[PDB]
Amino acid sequence: MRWGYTSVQGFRDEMEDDIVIRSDAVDSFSYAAVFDGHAGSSSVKFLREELYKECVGALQAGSLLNGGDFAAIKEALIKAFESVDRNLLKWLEANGDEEDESGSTATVMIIRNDVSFIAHIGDSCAVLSRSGQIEELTDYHRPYGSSRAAIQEVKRVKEAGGWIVNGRICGDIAVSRAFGDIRFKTKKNDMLKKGVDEGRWSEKFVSRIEFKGDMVVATPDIFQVPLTSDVEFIILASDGLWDYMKSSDVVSYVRDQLRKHGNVQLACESLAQVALDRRSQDNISIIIADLGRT
Amino acid sequence: MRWGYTSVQGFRDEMEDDIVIRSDAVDSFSYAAVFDGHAGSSSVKFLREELYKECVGALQAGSLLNGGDFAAIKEALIKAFESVDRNLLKWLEANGDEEDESGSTATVMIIRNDVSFIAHIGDSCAVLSRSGQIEELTDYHRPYGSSRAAIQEVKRVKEAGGWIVNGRICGDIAVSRAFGDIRFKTKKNDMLKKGVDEGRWSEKFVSRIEFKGDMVVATPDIFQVPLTSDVEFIILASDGLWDYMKSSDVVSYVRDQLRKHGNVQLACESLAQVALDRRSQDNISIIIADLGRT
Ligand SMILES: [Mn+2]
Ligand SMILES: [Mn+2]
Ligand SMILES: [Mn+2]
Ligand SMILES: [Mn+2]
């Protein structure tokens, strides 16, 4: 397979997306990741190296990619995400500037040759084309909406003692899973107190709050995707694409580009420009795995 | 570019070679290494991630992040090797210890876009083909031979107070640069005492020895090679290949393989078989970078 990738600032005043594509030829695997940072870049910077190291370390301990055990691979990937977040929060606490209020979502794909695994938190999305037809692979982690996934996130956020207004946890964050975001995790009580001093809430209001767990978590959903001959390409992208283009349209567009010139990098660059043409207001990051089939 | 690799035990009763190939598509960077361990695998095991981590770190530190002059890259690679060795020596002592007399040679290729760097200690070898002709990229670090490099190694080993018998420092080690080998570095006076206790040499003989520096060092030679279109492929391999096949024959063989079927992995596998056919008695490891020219 071949990679196409692009990651551009677009119309935003800062670039907080990043992409990683790394391969181990000896162990026949690749790692691709889209990170969509928010409220600064410190979390993305941390992830850009730390997350690969931890995921690969976890998969190599016991040769998990080789022995075909999904449950074991899922366990390892979740543990890796959670470990990285714990270390990120420590880093944020020790290098804090507070607010360093940064965080990042993450959509990761590991491929080893016939199978791929997706590990996902947040609001980027991964999809594939199977015999011309789109299949969406990930679910958004949003504290609103009508999907089963949405209902479950709202349930979790509320059980943690959080509240939601206008689709935002504590009227603040509109994604319910992410790396970083320490004020919704280990520093949530300080958050409340800061809110009182700032005039967001009343002392009376915050005195009534009881937290039982983190409102935002870094625990990923893991998906197994066998790379059967009918799987033509896979796209990982940030919401700078998906918020501005229907996913079926994205897949059809990439299909057409590849038919036109067979060049996945060119296809990827063209797609990003189409997002901008459709007035995308966000950073845009896109990774396409062209599997050289159809 | 495409990678071919093979790493086989051959007729040895243990496998002490290893290979690493890691690529980063977004930064157009890759790292490839051949390690030939001796007297155990502990040094190779350490180097497998530790040398990579240190080299990648170094080449992204400070200004190097934007390229850098050759002198600065050379200094960074040398310091990285030397740092890794210091940490390896500490390690060998703190873990599992004695007699851990392990060590390892290392030949590393880093590709940063259109330029390659070779960083080398020991007696693996790297070569390239330019328009069908061989160019050797590395010198053997052996305390024997007639080459200029050989003369230099012998001179350094003697200045440090070492002596050489039958191609071997203190009748023991047959390479003059390597990772690990603590008994030729920080524990050399203890080596002498040990030799006395074990009957290897007299107390009188050792009393006259005065060490001024390490006999074996981890300081690499660094070479820069522009990756122009006439550079067809680059081969890194352990001496299990080179001791049994002329280097010009290796290059011709690989050229003929690629011309015939265009498959670098098959070329690599076939080459290793030729080494076995030529009565190689050692572990054999080979990495071929096929740069994809006509
Ligand atoms: Mn963002
Ligand atoms: Mn975004
Ligand atoms: Mn060996
Ligand atoms: Mn050898």
From Swiss-Prot, chains A, B:
GO terms for biological process: dephosphorylation; photosynthetic electron transport chain; photosystem stoichiometry adjustment. GO terms for molecular function: magnesium ion binding; manganese ion binding; phosphatase activity; protein serine/threonine phosphatase activity. Its cofactor is Mg(2+); Mn(2+). Mn(2+) 2 binds at residues 36, 239, 282. Its EC number is 3.1.3.16. Keywords: Chloroplast, Hydrolase, Magnesium, Manganese, Membrane, Metal-binding, Plastid, Protein phosphatase, Transmembrane, Transmembrane helix. Mn(2+) 1 binds at residues 36-37. Residues 2-291 form the PPM-type phosphatase domain. The keyword Secreted does not apply. Binds 2 magnesium or manganese ions per subunit. One of its GO terms (cellular component) is thylakoid. It catalyses: O-phospho-L-seryl-[protein] + H2O = L-seryl-[protein] + phosphate; O-phospho-L-threonyl-[protein] + H2O = L-threonyl-[protein] + phosphate. Belongs to the PP2C family. This is Protein phosphatase 2C 57. It comes from Arabidopsis thaliana (Mouse-ear cress). The chain holds residues 59 to 351 of 388 of the full protein.
